[PDB]
Design a protein around this ligand. Structure first.
Ligand SMILES: *[C@@H]1O[C@H](CO)[C@@H](O[C@@H]2O[C@H](CO)[C@@H](O)[C@H](O)[C@H]2NC(C)=O)[C@H](O)[C@H]1NC(C)=O
Ligand SMILES: *[C@@H]1O[C@H](CO)[C@@H](O[C@@H]2O[C@H](CO)[C@@H](O)[C@H](O)[C@H]2NC(C)=O)[C@H](O)[C@H]1NC(C)=O
Ligand SMILES: *[C@@H]1O[C@H](CO)[C@@H](O[C@@H]2O[C@H](CO)[C@@H](O)[C@H](O)[C@H]2NC(C)=O)[C@H](O)[C@H]1NC(C)=O
Ligand SMILES: CC(=O)N[C@@H]1[C@@H](O)[C@H](O)[C@@H](CO)O[C@H]1O
Ligand SMILES: CC(=O)N[C@@H]1[C@@H](O)[C@H](O)[C@@H](CO)O[C@H]1O
Ligand SMILES: *[C@@H]1O[C@H](CO)[C@@H](O)[C@H](O)[C@H]1NC(C)=O
Ligand SMILES: *[C@@H]1O[C@H](CO)[C@@H](O)[C@H](O)[C@H]1NC(C)=O
Ligand SMILES: *[C@@H]1O[C@H](CO)[C@@H](O)[C@H](O)[C@H]1NC(C)=O
Ligand SMILES: *[C@@H]1O[C@H](CO)[C@@H](O)[C@H](O)[C@H]1NC(C)=O
Ligand SMILES: *[C@@H]1O[C@H](CO)[C@@H](O)[C@H](O)[C@H]1NC(C)=O
Ligand SMILES: *[C@@H]1O[C@H](CO)[C@@H](O)[C@H](O)[C@H]1NC(C)=O
Ligand SMILES: *[C@@H]1O[C@H](CO)[C@@H](O)[C@H](O)[C@H]1NC(C)=O
Lengths: 50, 268, 170, 382, 50
């Protein structure tokens, strides 16, 4: 719903507050999202590069 | 009466999870150790930039607020009420009693006498804090309910306020009031200013502590270093620049001004 | 950059932490300049003093010992050396050590050497007479130490003339 | 400028403020005028201590006397040599002392991928970048040149042996006890007991390369140096190692400082007890100081974080995201906005690469001094 | 209209300050190597015989 990105999506085990959509890291990069339809938190990592 | 907040009126600036990260924000906050009015049991107050609002009881005497610019007809206003049933947000043009309230038979609501042109409806001891703000036609409300182990005095401690509501109204606001349940059978008001804070985030993502970075030199140092611990030393923190007043505009006299007294003052 | 104006500050806020880096870089340099001086001069535990006599075997150190008739208490040669050498956000900080303090470190290093040879640099200062210390040093360069005692006056005169030539050369 | 002097929060809450080279009558208790500015919140005393927090022009501050205080620092005690034209002082005893010296030899090898940092896998930005020539081959050449010399730095401090010497199983070194600095098999990486206290005390185009020598290999090198010196003296640094009993080696070293050998042989047990008791105090003072090693770690991390935190500045554009300029602008208008980001990000990457060259040239001199001390203090007597 | 010119002024004035600071960094490392030589001379020529 607006957040455009690339990466691997994985089942999370963090717990947002029930009004927060996505989570950010220190140095400010999106690293978690919440799926709008099912409302579950998913981690996002950078595609296996190097 | 007036009283002193200690560390009160901290709200989550927005969504977005977060953990242990002394994150720095600029926003409208209630400064630490402020001068908060005290009210007992009430009058028309200002708004001017957001509002902190706590309250204490076991019964429910505080039964919502009313907002707006004129608190009458000829201009629109909000109305937030709670009978013994549940909350009733409402936005019409009203005619408000200059002393509006509700009774407690248990018949009540001498609040207004008009409900015209409604543009939004909705229906459905203790310490109850609220932060009200109004930006870009949205009226945001944060809140928190902590249990005191007193009855009706402002305690001390830290407790961050979580967002509740969002209303795309468009309404202008300059004044507000309160609503009380009479007798038939304590509350404070702070104001918010643009400050800069340093919030400490837990590993679950909750705000556990904060630093107001304009209280004293120690806090400005903590903000400059982005930490809560500071070892003995000395650091460059800002700058001092004298201020100039008035603007003196110097110039020359007026020798060859203009001899208009010839063309506009001729005899023929 | 901006300088007073306010239309400039909001535009410069868009560049990130470029100005924080530069202030860190300049502050590190300024903290290093005091450590430079601490490492060169504060190489002595105590502040040593010369005795009120000057019986040093005919050797004369008066041009390099401190001058008691001065606010700065510098020596003659240190006085010769010191006579030969607000804006748009710019500032000059003062050094942590005054140069009175630096002259006081140097005179103590001098009195340690003239009175104890090299013993104060390895522990407690142990006094020794200056001619005997000069004779220890002649051994260190491979000359036998009666060459010093049988030529003491000539050696002291040569030292004194060479010290006199330095001011003229300065 | 305005500076804040704190005696530490983990101790007090009081504070003082320095207004730098401002006359103290035009600032807006304790107001004190210094050659360095006006100091507020500290009291001026007449004593003189060792410097704690440096204010300037001979003035320091401390949290001692309750509040912050100020004063003129102390150069040191006052010793008065009783010099005369026929007096001498001679020592009658000695102490064996042992001290530490800490030196950085390496820093972390990092690599960047210019294209993945500036553009982040988007063909629009990547084609505009080609117009800038070869800046991003130069940046990589520079970072590779400084990542190779970090391994060269370690090789010249530690590979100062040809053989890996081992110490004998039965260890009788004349009363001297080296057990806290000799390798320990039941420990991690076969480190010594004091090498452990030391190892306990101290995303988008960015990678960290591992060093060529592991920590196990470097601990092996130091145990070979240490077994060479306990067992052969200084002979292994000049040729083949020739064994000598440890107290006779100690007697040679006493000769080297101008004491005779009978002074060692008649005081053997006392000299050995002093040595053992002084090695026992290093272990306490560390177990209870590695700031020069901590600072080079901190500087590198503080720079790498500033590099990433610049990926979220506009530099005068509509956003910081290329998927937002490629979504609300047509290609002729998004070129002008992408170039503003390219210029800023290139500037920031090149600033990072200059400051690393200047920091590596300083680590290099420290490692060059460490290599000279290993030759002149460990394989010899200086 | 003015923001365009003020950004050019800013760019030039920031480039000047970076040039200044980089050269001060290079010039201070040369002063440090000299103070290090002075410390060794004070140790080895004043506190001993070389
Ligand atoms: C040490 O040397 C200085 C010369 O630099 C001596 O001071 C001078 O002495 C001559 C006569 O010997 C006078 O004419 C000068 O006026 C002196 N210069 C001064 C006092 O500045 C000094 O006397 C020597 N010390 C001793 C103990 O003889
Ligand atoms: C030289 O100094 C040592 C101390 O370093 C003296 O030995 C100490 O003697 C006292 C009193 O006899 C004992 O309490 C200590 O245990 C001794 N120290 C050690 C390490 O054994 C020694 O007596 C001194 N020698 C002379 C001649 O004065
Ligand atoms: C060398 O010193 C060490 C002390 O660090 C001695 O080892 C310890 O001695 C104590 C006292 O008996 C024991 O409790 C420990 O178990 C010993 N081992 C440790 C701490 O690892 C060691 O014995 C000394 N060597 C000789 C030959 O005396
Ligand atoms: C130069 C001069 O005096 N001009 C006069 C002025 O003083 C007067 O106030 C005005 C009204 O009569 O007429 C004209
Ligand atoms: C320099 C200083 O005071 N450091 C203290 C330390 O002594 C103490 O153990 C710790 C626990 O609060 O806090 C910090
Ligand atoms: C709050 O302000 C009023 C204004 O007159 C003042 O009288 C009162 O003392 C203030 N309270 C505090 C706690 O500073
Ligand atoms: C509570 O007040 C609202 C305000 O209009 C009203 O609609 C509602 O009916 C009230 N509750 C009851 C039980 O009447
Ligand atoms: C609001 O109410 C007044 C009086 O009932 C009416 O004249 C006016 O038309 C109403 N507003 C609108 C937009 O219809
Ligand atoms: C919340 O935080 C506490 C303490 O920080 C932690 O013990 C707990 O596991 C976290 N999660 C919960 C309570 O779900
Ligand atoms: C004309 O002259 C008279 C008298 O000097 C003066 O009052 C008046 O201001 C003059 N008119 C103009 C237009 O200057
Ligand atoms: C500050 O101004 C006063 C008033 O002229 C003056 O007496 C004082 O000396 C000034 N400060 C210094 C450090 O000179
Ligand atoms: C410090 O000593 C001087 C001696 O001249 C004296 O005048 C001054 O009052 C003393 N300061 C304090 C704070 O006692």
């Amino acid at each position: 719903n607006g957040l455009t990105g690339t990466g691997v999506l994985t089942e999370s085990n963090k717990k947002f507050l029930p009004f927060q959509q996505f989570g950010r890291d220190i140095a400010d990069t999106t690293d978690a999202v919440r799926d709008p339809q099912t409302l579950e938190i998913l981690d996002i990592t950078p595609c296996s590069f190097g | 009466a007036y009283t002193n907040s200690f560390t009160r009126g901290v709200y989550y600036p927005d969504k977005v999870f977060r953990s242990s990260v002394l994150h720095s924000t600029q926003d409208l906050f209630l400064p630490f150790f402020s001068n908060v009015t005290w009210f007992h049991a009430n009058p028309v107050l200002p708004f001017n930039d957001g509002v902190y609002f706590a309250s204490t009881e076991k019964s429910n005497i505080i039964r919502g607020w009313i907002f707006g610019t004129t608190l009458d007809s000829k201009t629109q206003s909000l109305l937030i009420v709670n009978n013994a049933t549940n909350v009733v947000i409402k936005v019409c043009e009203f005619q408000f009693c200059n002393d509006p309230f509700l009774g407690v038979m248990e018949s009540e609501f001498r609040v207004y006498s008009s409900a015209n042109n409604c543009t939004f409806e909705y229906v459905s001891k203790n310490l109850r804090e609220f932060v009200f703000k109004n930006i870009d036609g949205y009226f945001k409300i944060y809140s928190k309910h902590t249990p005191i182990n007193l009855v009706r005095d402002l305690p001390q401690g830290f407790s961050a306020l979580e967002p509740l509501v969002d209303l795309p109204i468009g309404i202008n606001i300059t004044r507000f009031q309160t609503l009380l349940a009479l007798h038939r059978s304590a509350y404070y008001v702070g104001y918010l200013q643009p400050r800069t804070f340093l919030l400490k985030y837990n590993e679950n993502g909750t705000i556990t502590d904060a630093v107001d970075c304009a209280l004293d030199p120690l806090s400005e140092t903590k903000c400059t270093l982005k930490s809560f611990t500071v070892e003995k030393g000395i650091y460059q923190t800002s700058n001092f620049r004298v201020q100039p007043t008035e603007s003196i505009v110097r110039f020359p006299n007026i020798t060859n001004l203009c001899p208009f007294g010839e063309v506009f003052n001729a005899t023929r | 950059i901006c300088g007073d104006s306010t239309e400039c500050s909001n535009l410069l806020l868009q560049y990130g932490s470029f100005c924080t880096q530069l202030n860190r870089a300049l502050t590190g340099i300024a903290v290093e300049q005091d450590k430079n001086t601490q490492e060169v001069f504060a190489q002595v535990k105590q502040i040593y003093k010369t005795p009120p006599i000057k019986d040093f075997g005919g050797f004369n150190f008066s041009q390099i010992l401190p001058d008691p008739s001065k606010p700065s208490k510098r020596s003659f040669i240190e006085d010769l050396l010191f006579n030969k050498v607000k804006f748009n956000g710019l500032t000059v900080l003062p050094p942590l050590l005054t140069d009175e303090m630096i002259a006081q470190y140097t005179s103590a290093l001098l009195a340690g050497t003239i009175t104890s040879g090299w013993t104060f640099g390895a522990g407690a200062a142990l006094q020794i007479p200056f001619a005997m210390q000069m004779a220890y040093r002649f051994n260190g360069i491979g000359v036998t130490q009666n060459v010093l005692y049988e030529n003491q006056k000539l050696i002291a005169n040569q030292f004194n003339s060479a010290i006199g030539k330095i001011q003229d050369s300065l | 400028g305005v500076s804040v002097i704190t005696p530490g929060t983990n101790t007090s809450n009081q504070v003082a403020v320095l207004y730098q080279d401002v006359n103290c009558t035009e600032v807006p208790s304790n107001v004190f005028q210094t050659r360095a500015g006006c100091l507020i919140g500290a009291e001026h005393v007449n004593n003189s201590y060792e410097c704690d927090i440096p204010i300037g022009a001979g003035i320091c501050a401390s949290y001692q006397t309750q509040s912050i205080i100020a004063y003129t620092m102390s150069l040191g005690a006052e010793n008065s040599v009783a010099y005369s034209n026929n007096s001498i002082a001679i020592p009658t005893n000695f102490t064996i002392s042992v001290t530490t010296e800490i030196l950085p030899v390496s820093m972390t090898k990092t690599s960047v991928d210019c294209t993945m940092y500036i553009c982040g896998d988007s063909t629009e930005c990547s084609n505009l970048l080609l117009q800038y020539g070869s800046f991003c081959t130069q940046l990589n050449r520079a970072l590779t040149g400084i990542a190779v010399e970090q391994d060269k730095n370690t090789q010249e401090v530690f590979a100062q042996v040809k053989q890996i010497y081992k110490t004998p199983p039965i260890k009788d070194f004349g009363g001297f006890n080296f057990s806290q600095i000799l390798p320990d098999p039941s420990k991690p990486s076969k480190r010594s007991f004091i090498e452990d206290l030391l190892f306990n005390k101290v995303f988008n185009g960015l990678t960290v390369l591992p060093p060529l020598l592991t920590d196990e290999m470097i601990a092996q090198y130091t145990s070979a140096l240490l077994a060479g010196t306990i067992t052969s003296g200084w002979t292994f640094g000049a040729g083949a190692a020739l064994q000598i009993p440890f107290a006779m080696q100690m007697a040679y070293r006493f000769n080297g400082i101008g004491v005779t050998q009978n002074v060692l042989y008649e005081n053997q047990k006392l000299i050995a007890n002093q040595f053992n008791s002084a090695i026992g105090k290093i272990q306490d003072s560390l177990s209870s100081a590695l700031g020069k090693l901590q600072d080079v770690v901190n500087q590198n991390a503080q720079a790498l974080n500033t590099l990433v935190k610049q990926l979220s500045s506009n530099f005068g554009a509509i956003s910081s995201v290329l998927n937002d300029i490629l979504s609300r602008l047509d290609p002729p208008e998004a070129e002008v906005q992408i170039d503003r980001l390219i210029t800023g990000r290139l500037q920031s990457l090149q600033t990072y690469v200059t400051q690393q060259l200047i920091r590596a040239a300083e680590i290099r001199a420290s490692a060059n001094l460490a290599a000279t001390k290993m030759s002149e203090c460990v394989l010899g007597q200086s």
